């Protein structure tokens, strides 16, 4: 009895809601991203007694940066050179090389130069796969993409690289984390935790799996929508990582051809005896941690087998690993490494896997538009970190299931790093009831 | 508003290997699988196969993995069957779909071709 409305300013209460999150950027750059954002130091707190239920398929924030990195690679591609006069016809004969299938395009061609008065031959070096062939003779060729969009060259001094980066809060909107080790994907939370802003994440593009990134806590995590069995794709988080070697080993001629103030870039010859680029894999890591991934797998399916194969059908995105380091984007016959089956009941030897490499690369969700790699000098070698697999399920039958290498979808890699946040809206006015009244 | 024309069909020799078509023409290509179902006369419809036209993976029923092949082309947005040896009991009505799916997940079929 005798109680009368208060009112209360700062209630620690919150909603779920939609914004627009900030990020942050870095001192050194290769310089809209080079020298802004700021670049703060974040800290984080213990929410104590708090429990908070999560969803890493519904939150928000993963499209929102997947539209970020399209418009930032669109910004940096705008101030390019457009390579449209290029598509006039090919005669090629490729036979320049020891060997020439290889690469097969060795392609002279007809370009006005500084005059505008009239076009004049010039030769370059090319690969196959960009190449396509026209119809009638065999000789004649095209460029693969310009019966549909047009081709824009990179500007070398400008390249874009894994740049970690900050995820800022605006005022009013606070990040919980979810510091807990064995996260489902979903469901409640007993150990939330607060930031002003995420760490380092790395804008990485892979296919197959993924690579340059975080690690799991305890053993290995296996992240799935639950709504129904049929799943587009599944995550595997690894808690241990393993060590891939990649290397292109010959030495490649950048030539340059004038265009106006633009200034074309092309292969003129490769260095010494042609050798395929190629990957290397410790193979009793690779084997163990293939095992072990099974034999935990095998926990959600009760009875049944488990055995793998490589994708089939669709583009070289799909049926390879396809990456890009340093200037060079590269794919990777993987159909050794998924050679393996198992019933229900340190760095001896290396597999070897063979690889090709192409120049014209199409935007890595969408057609219709395509951007033509430079060619990059000298031989290239590269030491990352695996840290998961994207993997996709066929039907089967009974007794046995199957499991595919997937993920042509950019958006689930960058799913599999953003589980842990979550974006909530602050209600700081919340009423009470009080023994006292006011002054009259 | 959405429409999925198809084209190829009528009498096919026994054993041959066929083609069907089909063009899809008001939505976002990229965002919807396509379901490829049969029905044939006295049976009730089956499922064949489905493709994913952004990236062109395909999955294929069990009992016929050899047989059946599909296939997209994103410009012309055009979706192509191709199966190989004819039989007999092969006769039947053929639809695709588009199919309705979460970030995750795939659901029920909307649209009949």
């Known amino acids: 009895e005798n109680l009368w409305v208060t009112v209360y300013y700062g209630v620690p209460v919150w909603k779920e809601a939609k914004t627009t999150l900030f990020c942050a950027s870095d001192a050194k750059a290769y310089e809209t991203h080079a020298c802004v954002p700021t670049d703060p130091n974040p800290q984080e707190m213990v929410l104590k007694n708090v429990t908070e239920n999560f969803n890493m398929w519904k939150n928000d924030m993963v499209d929102q940066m997947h539209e970020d990195v399209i418009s930032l690679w669109d910004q940096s591609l705008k101030p390019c050179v457009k390579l449209t006069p290029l598509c006039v016809t090919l005669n090629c004969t490729n036979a320049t090389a020891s060997n020439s299938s290889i690469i097969e395009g060795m392609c002279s061609f007809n370009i006005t130069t500084e005059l505008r008065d009239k076009r004049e031959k010039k030769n370059a070096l090319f690969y196959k796969l960009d190449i396509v062939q026209l119809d009638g003779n065999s000789s004649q060729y095209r460029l693969i993409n310009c019966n549909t969009s047009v081709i824009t060259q990179a500007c070398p001094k400008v390249s874009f690289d894994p740049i970690p980066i900050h995820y800022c809060a605006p005022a009013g909107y606070a990040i919980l984390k979810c510091n807990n080790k064995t996260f489902t994907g979903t469901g409640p939370c007993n150990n939330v935790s607060t930031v002003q802003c995420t760490h380092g994440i790395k804008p990485v593009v892979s296919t197959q799996l993924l690579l340059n990134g975080s690690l799991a806590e305890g053993e290995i995590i296996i992240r799935s929508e639950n709504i129904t069995k049929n799943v587009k794709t599944i995550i595997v988080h690894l808690n241990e990582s393993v060590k891939i070697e990649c290397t292109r080993p010959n030495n490649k001629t950048r030539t340059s051809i004038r265009i106006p103030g633009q200034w074309f870039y092309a292969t003129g010859q490769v260095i010494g005896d042609i050798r395929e680029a190629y990957c290397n894999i410790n193979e009793s890591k690779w084997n163990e941690t293939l095992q072990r991934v099974s034999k935990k797998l095998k926990e959600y399916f009760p009875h049944k087998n488990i055995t793998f194969q490589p994708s089939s059908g669709g583009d070289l995105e799909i049926t390879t690993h396809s990456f890009n380091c340093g200037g060079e984007f590269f794919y990777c016959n993987t159909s050794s490494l998924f050679n393996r089956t198992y019933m229900a009941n340190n760095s001896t030897r290396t597999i070897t896997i063979h690889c090709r490499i192409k120049q014209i690369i199409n935007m890595w969700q969408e057609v219709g538009r395509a951007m033509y790699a430079p060619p990059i000098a000298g031989n290239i070698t590269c030491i990352s970190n695996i840290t998961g697999l994207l993997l996709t399920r066929d039907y089967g039958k009974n007794n046995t299931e199957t499991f595919r290498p997937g993920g042509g979808n950019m958006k689930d890699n960058w799913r599999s790093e953003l589980y842990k946040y979550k974006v909530v809206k602050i209600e700081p006015l919340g009423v009470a009831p009080t023994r006292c009244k006011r002054r009259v | 508003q959405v429409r999925l024309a198809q084209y190829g069909g009528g009498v096919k020799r026994l054993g041959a290997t066929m083609t069907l078509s089909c063009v899809a023409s008001?939505?976002?290509?990229?965002?919807?699988?396509i379901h490829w179902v049969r029905q044939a006369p006295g049976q009730g419809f089956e499922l064949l196969g489905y493709?994913?036209?952004?990236?062109?993976?395909?999955d294929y029923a069990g009992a016929l993995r050899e047989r059946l092949s599909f296939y997209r082309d994103k410009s012309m947005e055009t979706l192509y069957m191709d199966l190989r040896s004819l039989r007999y009991d092969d006769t039947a009505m053929y639809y695709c779909?588009?199919?309705?799916?979460?970030?995750?997940?795939?659901?029920?079929?909307?649209?009949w071709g």
């Open positions: 008001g939505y976002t290509f990229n965002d919807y699988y």
């Open positions: 493709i994913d036209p952004a990236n062109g993976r395909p």
């Open positions: 779909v588009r199919n309705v799916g979460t970030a995750g997940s795939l659901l029920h079929y909307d649209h």
